[PDB]
């Protein structure tokens, strides 16, 4: 089942031992993928620790792509949380 996390415990995972971001109100761990995302390291970076959806839109993602990021799902943003950010 669900593991939930707070925006304050998802921002500490900001950094290159530990990033994390939220899309769509899932968290995903990133760590290892920075070095292999097609889009570069930076653009994560950049977003790394809170909310990403919107960037991730902008920029357009395929759906090959989107299937790849189930792969990094760790849990969910906790429900309180959800309206201090957008689904
Ligand atoms: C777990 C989440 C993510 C996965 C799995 C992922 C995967 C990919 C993949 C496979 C591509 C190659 C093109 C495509 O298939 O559409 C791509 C390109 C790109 N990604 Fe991501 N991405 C993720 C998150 C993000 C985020 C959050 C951003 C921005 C903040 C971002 C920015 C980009 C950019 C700028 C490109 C290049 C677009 C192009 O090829 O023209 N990605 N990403």
């Known amino acids: 089942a669900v593991k ?7 921002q500490k995972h900001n950094n290159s031992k530990s990033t ?3 899309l769509h109100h899932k968290v995903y761990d990133l ?9 570069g390291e930076e653009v994560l970076r950049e977003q790394a620790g809170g909310d990403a959806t919107e960037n991730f839109e902008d920029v357009g993602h395929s759906t090959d792509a989107r299937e790849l990021s189930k792969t990094f799902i760790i849990g969910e943003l906790h429900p309180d949380d959800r309206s201090k950010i957008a689904k």
């Open 4 to 10: 939930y996390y707070t925006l304050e415990e998802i």
């Open 20 to 22: 994390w971001l939220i």
């Open 31 to 39: 760590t290892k993928f920075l070095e292999e995302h097609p889009g």
